[PDB]
Each structure stands twice: as C-alpha cells, then as structure tokens.
Design a protein around this motif. Structure first.
Motif, PDB file in Angstrom:
ATOM      1  N   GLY A  71     -28.487 -16.839  26.604  1.00 58.38           N
ATOM      2  CA  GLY A  71     -28.450 -15.706  27.497  1.00 58.38           C
ATOM      3  C   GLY A  71     -28.904 -14.394  26.896  1.00 58.38           C
ATOM      4  O   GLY A  71     -28.867 -13.373  27.592  1.00 58.38           O
ATOM      5  N   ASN A  72     -29.324 -14.378  25.640  1.00 51.84           N
ATOM      6  CA  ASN A  72     -29.756 -13.163  24.965  1.00 51.84           C
ATOM      7  C   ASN A  72     -31.191 -13.352  24.481  1.00 51.84           C
ATOM      8  O   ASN A  72     -31.808 -14.397  24.688  1.00 51.84           O
ATOM      9  CB  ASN A  72     -28.812 -12.824  23.799  1.00 51.84           C
ATOM     10  CG  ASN A  72     -28.706 -11.322  23.542  1.00 51.84           C
ATOM     11  OD1 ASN A  72     -29.592 -10.540  23.916  1.00 51.84           O
ATOM     12  ND2 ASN A  72     -27.608 -10.912  22.910  1.00 51.84           N
ATOM     13  N   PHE A  73     -31.723 -12.334  23.820  1.00 54.00           N
ATOM     14  CA  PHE A  73     -33.062 -12.403  23.257  1.00 54.00           C
ATOM     15  C   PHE A  73     -33.025 -11.954  21.808  1.00 54.00           C
ATOM     16  O   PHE A  73     -32.209 -11.118  21.424  1.00 54.00           O
ATOM     17  CB  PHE A  73     -34.060 -11.532  24.049  1.00 54.00           C
ATOM     18  CG  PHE A  73     -33.712 -10.068  24.075  1.00 54.00           C
ATOM     19  CD1 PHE A  73     -34.181  -9.209  23.092  1.00 54.00           C
ATOM     20  CD2 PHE A  73     -32.933  -9.551  25.093  1.00 54.00           C
ATOM     21  CE1 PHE A  73     -33.861  -7.859  23.116  1.00 54.00           C
ATOM     22  CE2 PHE A  73     -32.609  -8.205  25.124  1.00 54.00           C
ATOM     23  CZ  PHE A  73     -33.073  -7.357  24.131  1.00 54.00           C
ATOM     24  N   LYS A 107     -36.902 -14.588  17.478  1.00 53.53           N
ATOM     25  CA  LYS A 107     -37.475 -15.925  17.636  1.00 53.53           C
ATOM     26  C   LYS A 107     -38.130 -16.125  19.003  1.00 53.53           C
ATOM     27  O   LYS A 107     -39.040 -16.956  19.142  1.00 53.53           O
ATOM     28  CB  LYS A 107     -36.398 -16.987  17.418  1.00 53.53           C
ATOM     29  CG  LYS A 107     -36.936 -18.411  17.414  1.00 53.53           C
ATOM     30  CD  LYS A 107     -35.812 -19.439  17.292  1.00 53.53           C
ATOM     31  CE  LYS A 107     -36.357 -20.864  17.371  1.00 53.53           C
ATOM     32  NZ  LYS A 107     -37.154 -21.233  16.158  1.00 53.53           N
ATOM     33  N   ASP A 108     -37.683 -15.397  20.026  1.00 51.08           N
ATOM     34  CA  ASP A 108     -38.291 -15.542  21.349  1.00 51.08           C
ATOM     35  C   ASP A 108     -39.676 -14.923  21.423  1.00 51.08           C
ATOM     36  O   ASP A 108     -40.370 -15.096  22.441  1.00 51.08           O
ATOM     37  CB  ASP A 108     -37.383 -14.927  22.425  1.00 51.08           C
ATOM     38  CG  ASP A 108     -36.006 -15.605  22.499  1.00 51.08           C
ATOM     39  OD1 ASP A 108     -35.938 -16.796  22.874  1.00 51.08           O
ATOM     40  OD2 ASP A 108     -34.986 -14.943  22.201  1.00 51.08           O
ATOM     41  N   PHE A 109     -40.104 -14.223  20.371  1.00 52.37           N
ATOM     42  CA  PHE A 109     -41.397 -13.549  20.361  1.00 52.37           C
ATOM     43  C   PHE A 109     -42.155 -13.813  19.065  1.00 52.37           C
ATOM     44  O   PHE A 109     -43.049 -13.039  18.706  1.00 52.37           O
ATOM     45  CB  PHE A 109     -41.218 -12.048  20.609  1.00 52.37           C
ATOM     46  CG  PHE A 109     -40.475 -11.749  21.880  1.00 52.37           C
ATOM     47  CD1 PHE A 109     -41.125 -11.826  23.108  1.00 52.37           C
ATOM     48  CD2 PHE A 109     -39.126 -11.426  21.858  1.00 52.37           C
ATOM     49  CE1 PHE A 109     -40.439 -11.589  24.281  1.00 52.37           C
ATOM     50  CE2 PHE A 109     -38.438 -11.176  23.031  1.00 52.37           C
ATOM     51  CZ  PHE A 109     -39.102 -11.257  24.245  1.00 52.37           C
ATOM     52  N   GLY A 110     -41.831 -14.907  18.381  1.00 54.40           N
ATOM     53  CA  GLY A 110     -42.586 -15.319  17.216  1.00 54.40           C
ATOM     54  C   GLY A 110     -42.425 -14.438  16.004  1.00 54.40           C
ATOM     55  O   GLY A 110     -43.239 -14.515  15.083  1.00 54.40           O
ATOM     56  N   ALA A 165     -46.563  -8.672  37.696  1.00 58.47           N
ATOM     57  CA  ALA A 165     -47.153  -9.972  37.395  1.00 58.47           C
ATOM     58  C   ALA A 165     -46.216 -10.857  36.584  1.00 58.47           C
ATOM     59  O   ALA A 165     -46.282 -12.089  36.694  1.00 58.47           O
ATOM     60  CB  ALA A 165     -48.477  -9.790  36.654  1.00 58.47           C
ATOM     61  N   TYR A 166     -45.335 -10.262  35.785  1.00 59.93           N
ATOM     62  CA  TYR A 166     -44.466 -11.043  34.908  1.00 59.93           C
ATOM     63  C   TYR A 166     -43.013 -10.574  34.952  1.00 59.93           C
ATOM     64  O   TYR A 166     -42.218 -10.925  34.075  1.00 59.93           O
ATOM     65  CB  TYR A 166     -44.986 -10.993  33.463  1.00 59.93           C
ATOM     66  CG  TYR A 166     -45.073  -9.609  32.839  1.00 59.93           C
ATOM     67  CD1 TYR A 166     -46.163  -8.775  33.085  1.00 59.93           C
ATOM     68  CD2 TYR A 166     -44.068  -9.145  31.978  1.00 59.93           C
ATOM     69  CE1 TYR A 166     -46.254  -7.514  32.506  1.00 59.93           C
ATOM     70  CE2 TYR A 166     -44.149  -7.891  31.392  1.00 59.93           C
ATOM     71  CZ  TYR A 166     -45.245  -7.076  31.664  1.00 59.93           C
ATOM     72  OH  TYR A 166     -45.341  -5.829  31.090  1.00 59.93           O
ATOM     73  N   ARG A 175     -44.280 -17.972  31.967  1.00 60.54           N
ATOM     74  CA  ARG A 175     -43.105 -17.281  31.444  1.00 60.54           C
ATOM     75  C   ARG A 175     -43.005 -15.899  32.078  1.00 60.54           C
ATOM     76  O   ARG A 175     -43.933 -15.091  31.963  1.00 60.54           O
ATOM     77  CB  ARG A 175     -43.188 -17.161  29.923  1.00 60.54           C
ATOM     78  CG  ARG A 175     -41.887 -16.643  29.249  1.00 60.54           C
ATOM     79  CD  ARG A 175     -42.176 -16.012  27.900  1.00 60.54           C
ATOM     80  NE  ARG A 175     -41.018 -16.114  27.022  1.00 60.54           N
ATOM     81  CZ  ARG A 175     -40.930 -15.577  25.809  1.00 60.54           C
ATOM     82  NH1 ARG A 175     -41.933 -14.864  25.315  1.00 60.54           N
ATOM     83  NH2 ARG A 175     -39.831 -15.764  25.083  1.00 60.54           N
ATOM     84  N   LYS A 176     -41.888 -15.636  32.753  1.00 67.84           N
ATOM     85  CA  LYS A 176     -41.602 -14.328  33.322  1.00 67.84           C
ATOM     86  C   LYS A 176     -40.239 -13.863  32.835  1.00 67.84           C
ATOM     87  O   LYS A 176     -39.367 -14.680  32.529  1.00 67.84           O
ATOM     88  CB  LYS A 176     -41.609 -14.352  34.853  1.00 67.84           C
ATOM     89  CG  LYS A 176     -42.911 -14.828  35.490  1.00 67.84           C
ATOM     90  CD  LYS A 176     -42.851 -14.693  37.008  1.00 67.84           C
ATOM     91  CE  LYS A 176     -44.045 -15.369  37.692  1.00 67.84           C
ATOM     92  NZ  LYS A 176     -45.328 -14.923  37.114  1.00 67.84           N
ATOM     93  N   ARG A 234     -43.561 -17.409  23.695  1.00 70.32           N
ATOM     94  CA  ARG A 234     -42.752 -18.557  23.315  1.00 70.32           C
ATOM     95  C   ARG A 234     -42.158 -19.151  24.580  1.00 70.32           C
ATOM     96  O   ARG A 234     -41.898 -18.425  25.550  1.00 70.32           O
ATOM     97  CB  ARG A 234     -41.617 -18.191  22.334  1.00 70.32           C
ATOM     98  CG  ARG A 234     -42.070 -17.897  20.901  1.00 70.32           C
ATOM     99  CD  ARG A 234     -42.830 -19.077  20.297  1.00 70.32           C
ATOM    100  NE  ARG A 234     -43.264 -18.861  18.915  1.00 70.32           N
ATOM    101  CZ  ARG A 234     -44.387 -18.250  18.552  1.00 70.32           C
ATOM    102  NH1 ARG A 234     -45.225 -17.752  19.471  1.00 70.32           N
ATOM    103  NH2 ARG A 234     -44.679 -18.128  17.265  1.00 70.32           N
ATOM    104  N   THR A 290     -39.406 -19.893  26.083  1.00 72.79           N
ATOM    105  CA  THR A 290     -37.979 -19.668  26.244  1.00 72.79           C
ATOM    106  C   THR A 290     -37.757 -18.624  27.324  1.00 72.79           C
ATOM    107  O   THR A 290     -38.586 -17.734  27.528  1.00 72.79           O
ATOM    108  CB  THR A 290     -37.294 -19.198  24.942  1.00 72.79           C
ATOM    109  OG1 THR A 290     -37.816 -17.922  24.551  1.00 72.79           O
ATOM    110  CG2 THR A 290     -37.512 -20.186  23.809  1.00 72.79           C
ATOM    111  N   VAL A 335     -35.941 -15.340  28.734  1.00 72.87           N
ATOM    112  CA  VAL A 335     -35.337 -14.127  28.198  1.00 72.87           C
ATOM    113  C   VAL A 335     -34.712 -13.346  29.346  1.00 72.87           C
ATOM    114  O   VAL A 335     -35.255 -13.333  30.458  1.00 72.87           O
ATOM    115  CB  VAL A 335     -36.364 -13.288  27.425  1.00 72.87           C
ATOM    116  CG1 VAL A 335     -36.711 -13.981  26.115  1.00 72.87           C
ATOM    117  CG2 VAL A 335     -37.623 -13.061  28.279  1.00 72.87           C
ATOM    118  N   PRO A 336     -33.584 -12.681  29.118  1.00 73.14           N
ATOM    119  CA  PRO A 336     -32.860 -12.028  30.212  1.00 73.14           C
ATOM    120  C   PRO A 336     -33.506 -10.715  30.633  1.00 73.14           C
ATOM    121  O   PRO A 336     -34.364 -10.158  29.948  1.00 73.14           O
ATOM    122  CB  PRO A 336     -31.471 -11.786  29.607  1.00 73.14           C
ATOM    123  CG  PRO A 336     -31.745 -11.622  28.143  1.00 73.14           C
ATOM    124  CD  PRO A 336     -32.868 -12.573  27.833  1.00 73.14           C
TER     125      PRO A 336
END
Ligand SMILES: [Ca+2]
Ligand SMILES: [Ca+2]
Lengths: 475, 476
Positions: free
Chosen positions: A79-81, A84-87, A474-475, B412-413, B463, B465, B467-468
C-alpha cells in the motif's frame, strides 16, 4: 608504479565544517593539515544533496536522470511506495569505475555505508525494517559489489555506536555486530587493510583502491562518544551555531535541527580524528607518494540555517561539500574555486591517475585533472546543476543552477504557477532573501545560459513551464 | 573505397504491406525485387511505434528513456501541453551517427521529413500552426542539422500533394512550395543528389550518406495521385482490408480507420514506384556495389486491425516494420527472423560499413552486422521492448515484451491495479484474444526474464507495481 587510490568520505558533512574554511566553529586539525598538503576545490557541490543520489553520481559519472538513482533505494510496505517501485538502485549490469579498476589489476576494498541497493524479501532483522512505510537495510550480495573483492559494508543503519557489517566471511543472515563508534571501527579496518599483515586483505603485488564511507556526522545526534563531546565542554549548540541564517524559532522534527549543532561539531571532530589515524598509517607505511588520497562528503547539512534541518535543498549548507586531493610529489598544494560537481569526481580521479582513456562515453561529468594539477587547459564551468526529483516524477520537482554569484531554484508542479527562489550569494551570503520578484530578466538569462543547457546535456525532461491538470489525465 | 549509405524510409508503412510477405493485398514490385537481392529482417519492430520516438532511436541508437525523445516534438499553445514542455526534441549537443559520419569525411544529405525539433516562436505560416492546441511545423536551422550539409527537408507537414521544403539556400520565411506528390519530388531531388551534376550536391571525392524520409503512406488519405489509386480499380477498402481482426463498427476519428485501406494500399504502391526510381538511378550510375542501401519504416499502421486506427500500440500491425539491407557482392540475399529493434539500426549499419570501432558507449542497441551478413555468432535477442510513454510520465504508461511467441503489454497508472494484455501470437496470429487472466505464471516469467532486464538496460524507471494516490502529492 601503478597508483593506489584512497577515498574517505563521511556522510552529511558540509564544507563549512572544515576549520580552514573559516566558517563553522569546528575543530578539524587533521583535515586542516591535510588541506595544506592538498589541492582543494573550495566550491564543490553535491548536485542532488542526498545520500543515494550522490553515491549514484560517484559510481557512474552520470547525472541522476540517466543513471536512474533519483532518490532513496528503499522498498515499500504494501500500500505504499518506495525507491524499488521506480528502479532506484545501482543496477547489477551497470559498469562503474570500480568495475574498471578491478579489470586494470587492482585490489579493491569498500568499508562502511553502501546505500545503493533496494532491500529484498525476506527482509533481514533491522530497526529500520520497516520504518515509516519502508524497508531500508540489507546486505550487498557478492554479485552486486562491482569489483570490490574486500567488503566490510552495510546498506543503511544509523546506530553509530552499534554498527553492523557484512564481509567476505558473513552470510546474509549473520552479519558482524559491532560495539564501537563506527568511524573508529572503520578506521581500524582501514588500518588492517593498509597493513595487509596476513596478506589476505589485498594482493601484495597489485595497486589498491580503498573506499571508507563513514556515517557520522549524519544523524542521529545521541550516539557520539563522550571523548569528542568533551572537546566542546562549556559550549552549547546556541553558542556554537552562530551562522546568521539559523532559525531557532522554526519547529523541527523531533531529533533534528540547530539545537543539535554541538553534537554535529563533536561528530565532525571525531571523524577528523579517525581520518587522521588512517592517513597517519598510510604515511607511516611509506605509501604517501604512490597513493592519491581524496576526501569529500556526499552532501552537507543545514542544521537550522534558513529553517531547514538537514539536506535535500538548494542552500549552500546542503550543496557545498569538502573536496580535496592529496598526492605529495605529484600534486602541488593549491586552492581553486572551480564550479565542481559530483559526476566530475569519477572522471577527474581517472585523469589524475593516468587513466583518462578508460573513461567511457557514458560519463557525463568532466575530467578536471588538469585544473587539480595546476595545469592550464580545462574549460571552467559557469554553473552547477541543482535537482530534487520526487519519486516517479522525473518531469517535475525542483531544478536550479548555482553560478559564481547566484543560486536559482525553480519548483514545478502540475496545474500550478512555477515558484522561483533566487539568491544573490554576493550581496546575500547566507541566502536569507529571495530576490526572484522583479528579477525576471536575470532569471530568464540564467535559465537560457545555465539551466536549459544542463538539462539538455543530461537528458532531463524537466522544463520551466506550467502544465495544465490535463497532462496527468493519461496516467 | 569507403562505402556509401542510402537510407529510404516511408512513414507509417507496416511490414505487412510488402507484397512478398503474403499478407496485405499490395502491389510492391520494386520492393519485392529489392528484397530478393537483400538481407531481409522479417521480425524487425519499432519499439515505440510513433514517428518522433523512432527517429530519436534511429539517430542515437538509444532507447527513448535515455535519449529523451519520448513523444511528438510539438509546441503547446498557452494553457496547453506539448513535447516542448518535456524536452522532446533532438538536442543540438547530441552527437548522432550523422555527426560521426560527417567527421569521417562523408558528404551528408537529408531529404524529406525531419520531425525532430520543437517549433519556435514566431511560428512559421503552416496549416498545422496551430492545430489542436499545438504548433507542429518549423524549419531546421543550419546549426541543428547534425552534419547533413545538403538539406531538403521540413518538420511536420502532411499535405502530400503540396509539400514545402527548406534547403541551404532558403531563409526560414520563404520555403520552397511544391506542387507534386512528395515521394515523387523527393525521388527527383535524390536522383539529382546521386547524379551530382556540376558538383552542387556533394563532394565527388567523398563517400556519401543520403537519407530520404518519405511521408506517405502516412495519413491523410485524400492526397494520393489518381494513377496509383487506378491500380486498385474495381476494389474497395472493404474488399482489400480482409485481415480477420479488422473491426469495421468501432468508432473512428474522422478521416481514419479501415475504410481508408484502399488509399493506404495506393500510397504503398506509389511509394514503391518512387523507391524503384531512386534505386534504378543508383544502379544506372554504377554505384550498386559501393552503396549500402537500407529500407525500413518508422512504425506500422493498424488500419482498423483490433479496433485501432493507426499506431502507438503493441499490436503486430503497428510494431512490425520493413527492414532490408542491399549491398550486392558483400551481402548474400537471405531472410532472417532475428528479433531486431529500432536502436539496433545505427550500430548494425556502422558494423556493416566497417565502422564498429566508432560506435560510442552511449549506444544501447546492438550491432547485428554478422547476422545480416549471414555469419554465425551473434547473440540473438529473446524479446523486443514495447513502450508507450505519456507526456511527462516517464514512470508510467504501457510497457511490454514481444518474443518469438508472445506479446505481453502492461499499463501502469497511479492508484490503479495494473492491466494485463497477453497474446499467443502462434495460436492467435491476429491477436484477437487476451489470455492474460489464465496465464498468471507465464506473465510472471515474461516480466522476470524479458521485461525487467530491458527496463534495467534502458534505465527506464517504470516497474510493474501498483503505487498509491499519495505518490503524486509531491508534484501536483
Ligand atoms: Ca547522506
Ligand atoms: Ca510516423
């Protein structure tokens, strides 16, 4: 013949803490003496003043956008970031300068804080696994040590009096648990590596590179030996932290801020003592003339200056780092105001050691070995890039430039006017006034002459323009 | 002795349009004959199937994350966003392969669509300045031509029957205004370049590189010479566009989609004719054995396949591009299924030309000159990267992998579960079924073995995964 390389760098030590800089009320006799034997870059900065981004720039000679090391290398709880979520890590496939020296026939050693890997599950036991939404600590597996055949290191861990290390001998689940102030322990290991008494620290027939990455004067402030606190007996953080821009009335997070300045100065003194032990041993061993010694830090520390507790800001107290190169017989002592930047370290070291041809094209920093050596011919920078990159937002956050006179910082959010901060470091040496308003023309010139050229050079997509809310659709 | 280089590439031409592929119902006699004499890479893709991202990869041999060319290089109107707001353009300081060849002593010519600069104010007169909130067209100033000392080119301009060009002789404010189908006019200029009558175009004593970048079969579809349409007399878009995955009842933007397939085939035929003219002149001039000739496109065009109008998607019709290398006496004709990628073009060409030692360390693509030459020993890729990058969102968007059997795409959004699309290209050749939900373990293996390694190689921070919502609070 082939030169040795000794790198010592503590964490969070601003250039102002060097006694010979005539800034902080500090006691650094060993570094003062070292400075008078060295070529000193007095204007060096940490362009992204944060531990992991700086170490990325050190190991790759690239700015953060292209090396991908754009924040902390931590791992999120569900539930967090996190990084590692962005390399955000040093990649196993990346060829660093330590890989290249290894292939040149060097023995290679790394002691202390590595801080370049994301932690992996199952997470090792650690007070910071997790902490505040993230797992922070792990070993560095042997295939991720980038040519360092001698290892005595950890990921991130701030208990300065009870540090923990992984070594060639330790498996992941049983690290060495130490009861000793980490800089002193690391100096002890550095001494043994230099002595190489049993011959099993390094190869007797090869040149060596040793990196010692100390953690103090990084926070916390309650893990300082009494011996070093005693040096400032009778003084207080108020009597010592006299910089005019300190904001005592600002509210700070518990454990941080200007009321810890005495502890900061005591840690600086302690690191100076341990640095002296390492250098004294190098010279006692007769390695002075064959060893290029370099001292810097990964970023500074504001300690309440302009209301900021530590780092990750454009102010002088966070960006300015020590930078000294000693090589008696080959570098004449000098001082230079070269606008030196963190990705310049790697190529400059290679230039100094006679290895310019081994600098790969991927290196974005510049080889300033000539300037360090007192030789004409380098193109002197007119600015240093400043950057803050929010996790996952490479096109946004803060960018800025530092020239020989100004510091400009611009913050860019989606659907908001750009915020401008401009300091005249000449008229306003402590950066207490923002003169951005009614300096549109000067700011425009700084953007056109300095910031855009750095951004284009590094591939960074950040631009000083507002964008509507629709861009995020868009994202 | 030093080899010449001729590159011809039309825009938006999918690999399936080549007659010898036995796919689209197309007439490409000149390209069919060229193919029988060439080394043909039948599985080549455009990894970011969009014009400006592909050209970025062609000129730098880097993937989009590190070259920064991650979308269209347009300039926003006030209150809008464009490529210029995110650095999307070839930088003046970037050293391309064309800069390198120039320093090697080549004459260098560029004809046609450049599409690599953001327009600057005051914006030149142009139908697309502005269009849909952005400015699209501009010249390329002399100091931004990256070693191309002969210039006959424009930025972005789709009026195929009335094109406009700038040259060495033209100021920004008076371009050449042509009344001629652009591929024919460009073939005319290329023939004049090759003939070099009275030495105006190039140095007779230097090897040359000529790039001809044609716009058709790119849209629009109402700028086709009637001659080329006449080749398909008696056919309709319905009778020609018979791919089983075409979705005729999807909703399409006005002027796009499967009902324009006849026009698309007519342009393909027209471009084939003009390509033939250029190659015939090269062979008539006796330059055949000293000139490496390469044909490709920047991306494909779905034309309604799986309900998509054009490009910028992971489907085969958008990713697959022609890719053929001719050099008689040095390259034996062959067909190869190598999983070739757009950043590989630059180093492979340098390899073929004996210039491998000039490939800089910044190039991320691979030199496959051995494979193209029929020599064993190259490390064959197991996948090709797919990417879609939203403006300003380098850590988000779509990423994917294409192997010899599967295409996997992940979107991924922020604050959303990931979406998964998986095609078994063997059993589902037209990619009409998403089998992602029944193949969770295969997808994990593809991510671990193919996608993550490409992402790490390219420095891409995306990546797979979730993300919140809080992740965006720092910059919104
Ligand atoms: Ca640090
Ligand atoms: Ca295109």
């Amino acid at each position: 013949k082939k030169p040795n390389l000794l790198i010592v760098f503590p964490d969070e030590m601003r250039a102002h803490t060097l006694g010979f800089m005539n800034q902080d009320r500090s006691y650094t006799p060993n570094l003062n003496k070292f400075a008078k034997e060295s070529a000193v870059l007095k204007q060096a900065v940490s362009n992204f003043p944060l531990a992991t981004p700086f170490r990325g720039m050190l190991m790759t000679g690239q700015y953060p956008y292209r090396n991908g090391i754009q924040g902390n290398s931590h791992t999120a709880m569900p539930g967090n970031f996190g990084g590692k979520d962005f390399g955000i890590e040093l990649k196993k496939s990346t060829r660093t300068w330590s890989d290249i020296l290894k292939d040149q026939g060097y023995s290679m050693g790394y002691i202390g804080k590595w801080h370049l890997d994301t932690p992996e599950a199952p997470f090792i036991p650690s007070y910071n696994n997790p902490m505040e939404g993230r797992y922070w600590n792990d070993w560095t597996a042997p295939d991720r040590r980038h040519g360092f055949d001698f290892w005595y290191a950890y990921g991130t861990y701030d208990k300065h009096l009870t540090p923990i290390y992984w070594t060639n001998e330790t498996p992941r689940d049983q690290p060495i648990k130490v009861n000793q102030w980490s800089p002193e322990h690391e100096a002890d290991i550095a001494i043994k590596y230099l002595r190489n008494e049993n011959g099993h620290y390094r190869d007797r027939d090869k040149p060596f590179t040793l990196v010692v990455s100390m953690n103090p004067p990084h926070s916390p402030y309650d893990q300082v030996p009494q011996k070093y606190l005693d040096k400032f007996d009778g003084e207080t953080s108020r009597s010592l932290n006299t910089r005019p821009n300190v904001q005592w009335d600002q509210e700070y997070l518990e454990g941080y801020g200007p009321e810890y300045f005495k502890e900061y100065m005591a840690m600086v003194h302690g690191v100076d003592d341990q640095f002296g032990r390492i250098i004294d041993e190098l010279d006692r061993l007769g390695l002075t003339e064959d060893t290029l010694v370099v001292f810097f830090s990964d970023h500074g520390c504001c300690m309440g200056s302009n209301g900021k507790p530590t780092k990750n800001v454009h102010y002088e107290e966070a960006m300015r780092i020590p930078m000294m190169f000693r090589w008696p017989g080959k570098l004449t002592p000098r001082q230079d105001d070269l606008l030196f930047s963190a990705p310049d370290i790697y190529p400059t070291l290679f230039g100094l050691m006679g290895l310019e041809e081994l600098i790969p094209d991927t290196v974005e920093g510049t080889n300033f070995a000539k300037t360090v050596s007192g030789i004409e011919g380098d193109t002197r920078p007119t600015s240093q890039l400043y950057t803050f990159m929010p996790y996952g937002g490479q096109s946004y956050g803060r960018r800025g430039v530092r020239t020989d006179r100004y510091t400009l910082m611009i913050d860019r959010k989606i659907a908001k006017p750009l915020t401008f901060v401009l300091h005249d470091n000449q008229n306003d040496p402590y950066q207490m006034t923002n003169i951005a308003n009614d300096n549109q023309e000067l700011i425009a010139q700084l953007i056109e002459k300095e910031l855009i050229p750095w951004l284009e050079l590094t591939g960074d997509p950040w631009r000083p323009t507002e964008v509507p809310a629709s861009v995020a659709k868009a994202y």
